[PDB]
Amino acid sequence: MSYNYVVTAQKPTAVNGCVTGHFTSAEDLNLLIAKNTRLEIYVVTAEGLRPVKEVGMYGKIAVMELFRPKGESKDLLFILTAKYNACILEYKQSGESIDIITRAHGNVQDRIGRPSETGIIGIIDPECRMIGLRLYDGLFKVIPLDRDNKELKAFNIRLEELHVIDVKFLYGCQAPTICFVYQDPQGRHVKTYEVSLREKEFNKGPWKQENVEAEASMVIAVPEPFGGAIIIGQESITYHNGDKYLAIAPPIIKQSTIVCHNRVDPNGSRYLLGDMEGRLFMLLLEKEEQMDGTVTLKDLRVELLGETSIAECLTYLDNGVVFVGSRLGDSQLVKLNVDSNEQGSYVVAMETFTNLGPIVDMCVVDLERQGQGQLVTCSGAFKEGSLRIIRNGKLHIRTVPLYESPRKICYQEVSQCFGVLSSRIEVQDTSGGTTALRPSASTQALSSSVSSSKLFSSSTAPHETSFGEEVEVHNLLIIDQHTFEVLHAHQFLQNEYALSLVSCKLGKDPNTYFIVGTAMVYPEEAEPKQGRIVVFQYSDGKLQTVAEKEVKGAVYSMVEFNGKLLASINSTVRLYEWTTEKELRTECNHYNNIMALYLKTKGDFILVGDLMRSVLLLAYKPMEGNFEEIARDFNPNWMSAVEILDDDNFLGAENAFNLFVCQKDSAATTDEERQHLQEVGLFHLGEFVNVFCHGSLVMQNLGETSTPTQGSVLFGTVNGMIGLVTSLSESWYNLLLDMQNRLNKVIKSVGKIEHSFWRSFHTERKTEPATGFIDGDLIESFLDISRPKMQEVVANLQYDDGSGMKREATADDLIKVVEELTRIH
Amino acid sequence: QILPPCRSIVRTLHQHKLGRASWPSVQQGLQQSFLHTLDSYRILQKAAPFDRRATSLAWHPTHPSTVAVGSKGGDIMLWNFGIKDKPTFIKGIGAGGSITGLKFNPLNTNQFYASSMEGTTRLQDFKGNILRVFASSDTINIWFCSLDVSASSRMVVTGDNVGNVILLNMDGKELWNLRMHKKKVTHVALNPCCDWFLATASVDQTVKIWDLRQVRGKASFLYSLPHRHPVNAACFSPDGARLLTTDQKSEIRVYSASQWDCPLGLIPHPHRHFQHLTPIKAAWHPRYNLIVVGRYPDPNFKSCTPYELRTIDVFDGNSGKMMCQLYDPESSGISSLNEFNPMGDTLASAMGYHILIWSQEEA
């Protein structure tokens, strides 16, 4: 009875992986970029990148590596998805037609297994003899690369080492050999195994285990003539090869964790290393000659080159040019010069690519024109943190750098400004408190304020602090809606994290307030025990504290509710009234929660999203002054976001990248049955939704009606993808699903992945086919197939044009339908 | 109560909002929050006594508060909370028809499957009306001990007091009743994730993993794990990868997917065997890697903790070591059973002549 439609408004922009090689031709240097479900293929030119082909996959690309078996004239591509779909792909071009051919495909999921902590790892031997996969603790899966293994059949080898950190195949070995770092009660260690195909087992490796740094975290397989392996830790870098052992502990790397690496020289003579502060280093391997013509490593050095965006991945292209693929900020092309500039940096940015992710909060505002909504998102993290302003006309994006992490956003029309919660990292100073690592919004405001309430900390106990502790400093920023200048910054208390934000009117009071919910955070507490609701008024360029309310917990969520304020505090939902004396007073409480993280409201009804008790339906009772529990979804779901679609339809998103929709149980004959919400819609989205919000970017056509879908809810995700959910009639749902099945018979899936499998609801507890959701992206894909294929799609299809009787559908009818659907976003 | 590392609650929640932290690391810190609040389940909610001792237990899957429970004389009760409508009761012979296995009907929640000492594997209504028997000894001093059912596969299975095992469909269709063990079958259970490999426990100090569809050849089995003593139970995870096992003397064994034969870590614990006491059966959390067991102290046990009391302990699965303990005076019997909701918000316990409810505090 709930039928919904989901469509992409902005494809994911974060880069999860990037590799180079010779994929499109033996002579071309290609760049391949993974953006979750998308694979982008470029040719590297003297000036930059030429796009050649972009594909979507029915899966989250989890592994992407080029390789070239014997008899192939150019590299092949292995991809593994998060649902364990494995495939080998080949690039094919003839004329203007570009097709990605599937050479091999199969699902390598086990029936049982616990996904590993450091995630899926996939590696390929340098001689293309086999693929190795670390999917589950205690197991190593091997896919032999036989020409006949078009089904990608595999076998498992027991791993004694249950906690593997990283693993690579070594170069220069007559037998396939892995080198990996693992963790046990004795510490971290590095070990190797040879891989025997005959025995389908490991054999003893060529060199003995070594202890490594407690935080040894990455393995690099060094090519010939060096061979061997480099192990990267937080304070040290070591190289191992047989009886060779060389370690350095350069202090420069200790300030920020190196998290990615890339080979610069084909021979391994130089590597780049990037850290969490966006610093970029060169790692240089010094050779020592030997009388027998072998080469050994003479020394290792690290040199700071400069700063980039915080890199998820790095790829050297050619000619000193580097692609910096970022998931937390914009990606970049940068140039490396041999000589530094005035400030001592060898890095110069050449080009920037927008990244909206992570999208942590957002709101829709008609900033310039009535009816023309624009989205203002909290995007990014640490120095890449920003606001992004998105408007149609495909989309124009304005970037507002903040140089710190945004957390929440609201709009205050009456003050013509936004309130934004943000946090910055500071470290201990030489003699005093802490110092910021760079200027940022909270330190560059036109005016600034600090809290002075002394009730925040009770019975504080001094605790010894080790040197170099970083701290989070939280602030409320007041930002002009036109200029995006930092008008004001209010700094919160030490150890106080601001979690929730509202702008609203309360009671009979004509003033509009900024309201913030916080938590006091101490390292040894399993859950916060202290927090505040603080009511501020913005006037004359500054924030004044109007009122406070102390609670014994974290104020996760707040929402304006019928002129009163509803707030969630750990396992409680509490309703406050705003008094004539400008204080919050509790009217009523609801207690039957584990942790109430998410709230939305409509009328007197309340949808509560829990940490683990997924959705709840409460009613406020105005003639009783209390809450009534109406119903709950008794299926467990680990929520990341929720939304009220209407009085009868409730949208949830959960941590396994699925959406679901709940409804009241219409066939309930008892109060007990009426208390069970039914999950009537299910959909594997493949994205992590951080925020739902009502609104639309498409221009609204006033009195447009007799349209396919009704309502518009936008949502923002970790990957920077923006999507839209809307509601469907029964007839439209049925029409589009018939279309889906027919489309699914015609569209070629990259890797021969079934759409139904991809979109099937899937968690570690249950896997079920999708229901109640149409894949709008797929629907739109009707418009890009050839006309004979369109005619095939609509063959023997009964269709009701406008209002009337059903008849045979033509391609033009469905072209028109799909064109109308594409304009809703 | 006191614990290893944790912090960064909303940091972690936000770092998941960033994609920084992994869901397992997330899920790890929320296991902790359950452990934290589980140290606040310390106030007991409800009790519900009746005639002869309890022998089995089962939750309503959809409903947190509704539960089915049976007796030592084959007397079933169906108790729900927040209702006050004096719950359902069915009586039996009272002496020799002891129910020993009990699982709801997935299709009709007001139905249920039952395994008794009478030797009548049955499906029955809470109003007493028997819909269908499923099997029978057809000869006295021979009865059933274990039972479980699937719904994704729609497959029924039961054990015996002799060591032969029986497997039915939801509508009869008997193709089974070969022998698997040499002595009584204590417990039996199927995989929820896959559908067509079985495990089974017996008095023979061995637990046996089967592949119901491929094997028909009288111990043409898949795996078989030996044990120092007989075993009361062996239960897959909800994840299906982590097969749990309980001895009869003092041990818990953790057999994972990866090479079923060798184990991961030994959780020694006193839950000692006895005739008139109901057999103890550890259990999983449906959504964490936690394990919950009732303690039956023994002076012979090499106790790590120096205070030895009958209670319920809370272990972590992949680690081995305890995390929380549930004690209540006015409950100074021994709980043989214990069964969190599939919800995981609430916990029921079965003591002889006493059923107990263990939910959180009312703030």
Short mmCIF file of all heavy atoms in Angstrom, two decimals, chain A residues 18-25 27-33 40-52 315-323 333-334 350:
data_model
loop_
_atom_site.label_atom_id
_atom_site.label_comp_id
_atom_site.label_asym_id
_atom_site.label_seq_id
_atom_site.Cartn_x
_atom_site.Cartn_y
_atom_site.Cartn_z
N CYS A 18 41.65 4.42 -6.73
CA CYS A 18 42.14 4.86 -8.02
C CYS A 18 43.37 4.06 -8.39
O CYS A 18 44.24 3.81 -7.55
CB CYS A 18 42.51 6.33 -8.03
SG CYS A 18 43.80 6.76 -6.83
N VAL A 19 43.43 3.64 -9.65
CA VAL A 19 44.58 2.92 -10.17
C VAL A 19 44.85 3.38 -11.60
O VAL A 19 43.97 3.89 -12.28
CB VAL A 19 44.38 1.39 -10.13
CG1 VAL A 19 44.13 0.93 -8.70
CG2 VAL A 19 43.23 0.97 -11.03
N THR A 20 46.09 3.21 -12.03
CA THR A 20 46.51 3.47 -13.40
C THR A 20 47.07 2.21 -14.04
O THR A 20 47.52 1.28 -13.37
CB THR A 20 47.52 4.61 -13.53
OG1 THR A 20 48.66 4.38 -12.69
CG2 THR A 20 46.86 5.94 -13.23
N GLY A 21 47.02 2.19 -15.37
CA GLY A 21 47.58 1.08 -16.12
C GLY A 21 47.23 1.23 -17.58
O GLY A 21 47.08 2.35 -18.05
N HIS A 22 47.21 0.13 -18.30
CA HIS A 22 47.03 0.16 -19.75
C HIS A 22 45.84 -0.74 -20.06
O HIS A 22 45.98 -1.89 -20.47
CB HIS A 22 48.30 -0.26 -20.47
CG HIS A 22 49.53 0.42 -19.96
ND1 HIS A 22 49.82 1.74 -20.24
CD2 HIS A 22 50.54 -0.02 -19.18
CE1 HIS A 22 50.96 2.07 -19.66
NE2 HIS A 22 51.42 1.02 -19.01
N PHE A 23 44.65 -0.19 -19.83
CA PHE A 23 43.39 -0.92 -19.89
C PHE A 23 42.66 -0.76 -21.21
O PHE A 23 42.13 -1.73 -21.75
CB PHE A 23 42.49 -0.45 -18.75
CG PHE A 23 41.20 -1.21 -18.62
CD1 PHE A 23 41.20 -2.58 -18.46
CD2 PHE A 23 39.98 -0.55 -18.62
CE1 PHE A 23 40.03 -3.29 -18.33
CE2 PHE A 23 38.80 -1.25 -18.48
CZ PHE A 23 38.83 -2.62 -18.34
N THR A 24 42.61 0.47 -21.73
CA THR A 24 41.87 0.75 -22.95
C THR A 24 42.66 0.39 -24.20
O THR A 24 42.07 0.11 -25.24
CB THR A 24 41.46 2.21 -22.99
OG1 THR A 24 42.62 3.04 -22.84
CG2 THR A 24 40.50 2.49 -21.87
N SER A 25 43.99 0.39 -24.10
CA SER A 25 44.84 -0.09 -25.17
C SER A 25 46.21 -0.34 -24.57
O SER A 25 46.54 0.18 -23.50
CB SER A 25 44.95 0.91 -26.32
OG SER A 25 45.93 1.89 -26.04
N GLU A 27 48.91 0.83 -25.61
CA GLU A 27 49.71 2.05 -25.68
C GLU A 27 49.20 3.14 -24.76
O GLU A 27 49.98 4.03 -24.39
CB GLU A 27 49.71 2.60 -27.11
CG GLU A 27 50.35 1.70 -28.18
CD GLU A 27 49.54 0.46 -28.51
OE1 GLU A 27 48.30 0.51 -28.39
OE2 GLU A 27 50.15 -0.57 -28.87
N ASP A 28 47.94 3.09 -24.36
CA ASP A 28 47.37 4.11 -23.50
C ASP A 28 47.76 3.91 -22.05
O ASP A 28 47.85 2.77 -21.56
CB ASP A 28 45.85 4.09 -23.61
CG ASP A 28 45.35 4.60 -24.94
OD1 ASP A 28 46.07 5.38 -25.60
OD2 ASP A 28 44.24 4.20 -25.35
N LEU A 29 48.01 5.02 -21.37
CA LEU A 29 48.03 5.05 -19.92
C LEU A 29 46.64 5.50 -19.50
O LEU A 29 46.23 6.63 -19.82
CB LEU A 29 49.10 5.99 -19.38
CG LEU A 29 49.18 6.12 -17.85
CD1 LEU A 29 49.54 4.77 -17.23
CD2 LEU A 29 50.16 7.21 -17.41
N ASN A 30 45.93 4.64 -18.79
CA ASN A 30 44.59 4.89 -18.30
C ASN A 30 44.64 5.20 -16.81
O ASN A 30 45.51 4.69 -16.09
CB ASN A 30 43.72 3.66 -18.55
CG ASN A 30 43.65 3.31 -20.02
OD1 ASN A 30 44.05 2.22 -20.43
ND2 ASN A 30 43.18 4.25 -20.82
N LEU A 31 43.67 5.99 -16.37
CA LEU A 31 43.29 6.13 -14.96
C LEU A 31 41.88 5.59 -14.75
O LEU A 31 40.94 6.02 -15.43
CB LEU A 31 43.35 7.59 -14.53
CG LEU A 31 42.87 7.94 -13.11
CD1 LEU A 31 43.67 7.21 -12.06
CD2 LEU A 31 42.95 9.43 -12.89
N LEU A 32 41.74 4.67 -13.81
CA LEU A 32 40.45 4.16 -13.38
C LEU A 32 40.17 4.65 -11.97
O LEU A 32 41.05 4.56 -11.09
CB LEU A 32 40.43 2.64 -13.44
CG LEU A 32 40.09 2.07 -14.82
CD1 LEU A 32 41.08 2.55 -15.89
CD2 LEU A 32 40.05 0.55 -14.77
N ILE A 33 38.96 5.16 -11.75
CA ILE A 33 38.54 5.75 -10.48
C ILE A 33 37.25 5.09 -10.04
O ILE A 33 36.31 4.97 -10.84
CB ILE A 33 38.36 7.28 -10.60
CG1 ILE A 33 39.62 7.91 -11.23
CG2 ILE A 33 37.99 7.87 -9.22
CD1 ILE A 33 39.61 9.42 -11.35
N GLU A 40 35.01 5.16 -13.38
CA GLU A 40 35.35 6.20 -14.34
C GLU A 40 36.67 5.84 -14.98
O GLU A 40 37.62 5.48 -14.28
CB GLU A 40 35.49 7.55 -13.65
CG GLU A 40 34.27 8.00 -12.87
CD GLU A 40 34.20 7.40 -11.47
OE1 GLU A 40 35.18 7.51 -10.71
OE2 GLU A 40 33.17 6.78 -11.14
N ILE A 41 36.74 5.94 -16.31
CA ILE A 41 37.94 5.65 -17.07
C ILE A 41 38.34 6.91 -17.81
O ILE A 41 37.55 7.43 -18.62
CB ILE A 41 37.70 4.47 -18.03
CG1 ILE A 41 37.17 3.23 -17.28
CG2 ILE A 41 38.99 4.12 -18.76
CD1 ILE A 41 36.44 2.25 -18.15
N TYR A 42 39.60 7.31 -17.62
CA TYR A 42 40.24 8.46 -18.25
C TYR A 42 41.50 7.99 -18.97
O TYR A 42 42.11 6.99 -18.60
CB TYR A 42 40.65 9.52 -17.23
CG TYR A 42 39.53 10.14 -16.46
CD1 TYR A 42 39.07 9.57 -15.29
CD2 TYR A 42 38.93 11.31 -16.90
CE1 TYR A 42 38.05 10.14 -14.57
CE2 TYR A 42 37.91 11.89 -16.20
CZ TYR A 42 37.47 11.30 -15.03
OH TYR A 42 36.44 11.88 -14.32
N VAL A 43 41.90 8.77 -19.96
CA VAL A 43 43.25 8.71 -20.52
C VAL A 43 44.06 9.87 -19.96
O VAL A 43 43.58 11.01 -19.92
CB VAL A 43 43.23 8.74 -22.06
CG1 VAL A 43 44.64 8.91 -22.60
CG2 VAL A 43 42.63 7.45 -22.60
N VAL A 44 45.28 9.58 -19.55
CA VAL A 44 46.18 10.58 -18.98
C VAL A 44 46.88 11.29 -20.12
O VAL A 44 47.49 10.65 -20.98
CB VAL A 44 47.21 9.94 -18.04
CG1 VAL A 44 48.16 11.02 -17.54
CG2 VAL A 44 46.54 9.24 -16.88
N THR A 45 46.80 12.61 -20.11
CA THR A 45 47.40 13.43 -21.14
C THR A 45 48.46 14.33 -20.52
O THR A 45 48.67 14.33 -19.31
CB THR A 45 46.32 14.28 -21.83
OG1 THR A 45 45.96 15.35 -20.96
CG2 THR A 45 45.09 13.43 -22.10
N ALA A 46 49.14 15.09 -21.38
CA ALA A 46 50.15 16.02 -20.90
C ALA A 46 49.55 17.08 -20.01
O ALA A 46 50.19 17.54 -19.06
CB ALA A 46 50.87 16.65 -22.09
N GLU A 47 48.31 17.49 -20.29
CA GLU A 47 47.65 18.54 -19.54
C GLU A 47 46.83 17.99 -18.40
O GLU A 47 46.64 18.68 -17.39
CB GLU A 47 46.76 19.38 -20.46
CG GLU A 47 45.69 18.61 -21.24
CD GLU A 47 46.15 18.22 -22.62
OE1 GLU A 47 47.32 17.80 -22.77
OE2 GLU A 47 45.34 18.33 -23.57
N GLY A 48 46.33 16.76 -18.53
CA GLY A 48 45.52 16.19 -17.49
C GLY A 48 44.89 14.85 -17.82
O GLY A 48 45.59 13.86 -18.06
N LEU A 49 43.56 14.83 -17.83
CA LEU A 49 42.78 13.63 -18.04
C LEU A 49 41.70 13.84 -19.09
O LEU A 49 40.99 14.84 -19.05
CB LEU A 49 42.11 13.19 -16.74
CG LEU A 49 43.06 12.82 -15.62
CD1 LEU A 49 42.26 12.55 -14.37
CD2 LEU A 49 43.93 11.64 -16.01
N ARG A 50 41.60 12.89 -20.02
CA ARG A 50 40.54 12.89 -21.01
C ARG A 50 39.53 11.82 -20.63
O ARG A 50 39.90 10.64 -20.61
CB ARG A 50 41.08 12.61 -22.40
CG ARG A 50 39.99 12.58 -23.47
CD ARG A 50 40.56 12.51 -24.86
NE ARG A 50 40.92 11.13 -25.22
CZ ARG A 50 42.15 10.62 -25.24
NH1 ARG A 50 43.22 11.34 -24.91
NH2 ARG A 50 42.31 9.35 -25.59
N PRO A 51 38.27 12.15 -20.32
CA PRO A 51 37.32 11.08 -19.98
C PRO A 51 37.04 10.27 -21.24
O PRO A 51 36.82 10.83 -22.31
CB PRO A 51 36.08 11.83 -19.51
CG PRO A 51 36.15 13.11 -20.21
CD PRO A 51 37.60 13.46 -20.34
N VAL A 52 37.06 8.95 -21.09
CA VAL A 52 36.75 8.04 -22.18
C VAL A 52 35.51 7.22 -21.89
O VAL A 52 34.74 6.92 -22.81
CB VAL A 52 37.96 7.13 -22.48
CG1 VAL A 52 37.61 6.16 -23.61
CG2 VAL A 52 39.16 8.00 -22.81
N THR A 315 47.69 8.35 -6.74
CA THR A 315 48.25 7.67 -7.90
C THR A 315 49.18 8.57 -8.68
O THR A 315 48.76 9.62 -9.18
CB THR A 315 47.13 7.15 -8.80
OG1 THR A 315 46.23 6.34 -8.04
CG2 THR A 315 47.72 6.31 -9.92
N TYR A 316 50.45 8.19 -8.75
CA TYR A 316 51.35 8.83 -9.69
C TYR A 316 50.96 8.48 -11.11
O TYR A 316 50.73 7.31 -11.44
CB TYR A 316 52.80 8.42 -9.46
CG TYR A 316 53.71 9.19 -10.38
CD1 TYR A 316 53.96 10.54 -10.19
CD2 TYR A 316 54.27 8.57 -11.48
CE1 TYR A 316 54.78 11.24 -11.05
CE2 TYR A 316 55.09 9.26 -12.34
CZ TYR A 316 55.34 10.59 -12.12
OH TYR A 316 56.15 11.28 -12.99
N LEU A 317 50.91 9.50 -11.96
CA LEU A 317 50.49 9.33 -13.34
C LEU A 317 51.74 9.29 -14.19
O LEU A 317 52.15 8.23 -14.66
CB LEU A 317 49.54 10.46 -13.77
CG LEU A 317 48.25 10.65 -12.98
CD1 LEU A 317 47.39 11.69 -13.67
CD2 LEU A 317 47.49 9.36 -12.80
N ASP A 318 52.35 10.45 -14.38
CA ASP A 318 53.56 10.61 -15.16
C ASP A 318 54.02 12.04 -14.95
O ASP A 318 53.26 12.90 -14.51
CB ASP A 318 53.31 10.33 -16.64
CG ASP A 318 54.58 10.05 -17.40
OD1 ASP A 318 55.37 9.19 -16.95
OD2 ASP A 318 54.80 10.68 -18.45
N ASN A 319 55.29 12.28 -15.29
CA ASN A 319 55.84 13.63 -15.43
C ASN A 319 55.62 14.46 -14.16
O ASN A 319 55.32 15.65 -14.23
CB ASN A 319 55.22 14.33 -16.63
CG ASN A 319 55.38 13.54 -17.91
OD1 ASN A 319 56.50 13.26 -18.34
ND2 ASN A 319 54.26 13.17 -18.52
N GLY A 320 55.79 13.84 -13.00
CA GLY A 320 55.67 14.57 -11.76
C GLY A 320 54.25 14.91 -11.36
O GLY A 320 54.06 15.64 -10.38
N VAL A 321 53.25 14.42 -12.09
CA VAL A 321 51.85 14.76 -11.86
C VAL A 321 51.23 13.67 -11.00
O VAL A 321 51.45 12.47 -11.25
CB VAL A 321 51.11 14.90 -13.21
CG1 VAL A 321 49.64 15.30 -13.01
CG2 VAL A 321 51.82 15.90 -14.09
N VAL A 322 50.45 14.07 -9.99
CA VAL A 322 49.79 13.14 -9.08
C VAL A 322 48.30 13.38 -9.04
O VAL A 322 47.84 14.52 -8.94
CB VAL A 322 50.35 13.23 -7.65
CG1 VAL A 322 49.63 12.22 -6.75
CG2 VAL A 322 51.84 13.01 -7.66
N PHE A 323 47.54 12.28 -9.10
CA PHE A 323 46.12 12.32 -8.78
C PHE A 323 45.93 12.00 -7.31
O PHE A 323 46.42 10.98 -6.82
CB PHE A 323 45.31 11.31 -9.58
CG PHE A 323 43.86 11.32 -9.21
CD1 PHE A 323 43.05 12.37 -9.54
CD2 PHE A 323 43.34 10.28 -8.47
CE1 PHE A 323 41.72 12.38 -9.17
CE2 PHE A 323 42.01 10.28 -8.10
CZ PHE A 323 41.20 11.34 -8.45
N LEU A 333 44.24 17.11 -9.13
CA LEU A 333 45.50 16.89 -9.83
C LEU A 333 46.48 17.94 -9.34
O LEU A 333 46.17 19.14 -9.37
CB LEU A 333 45.35 16.98 -11.35
CG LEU A 333 44.06 16.45 -11.98
CD1 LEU A 333 43.98 16.75 -13.47
CD2 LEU A 333 43.95 14.99 -11.69
N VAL A 334 47.67 17.48 -8.94
CA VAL A 334 48.75 18.35 -8.48
C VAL A 334 50.01 18.07 -9.28
O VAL A 334 50.21 16.98 -9.81
CB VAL A 334 49.05 18.18 -6.99
CG1 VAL A 334 47.81 18.45 -6.17
CG2 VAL A 334 49.62 16.79 -6.71
N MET A 350 46.89 21.76 -9.64
CA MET A 350 46.57 22.01 -11.03
C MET A 350 45.08 22.06 -11.29
O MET A 350 44.61 22.92 -12.05
CB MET A 350 47.14 20.90 -11.90
CG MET A 350 48.64 20.80 -11.91
SD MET A 350 49.18 19.21 -12.59
CE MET A 350 48.21 19.08 -14.09
#
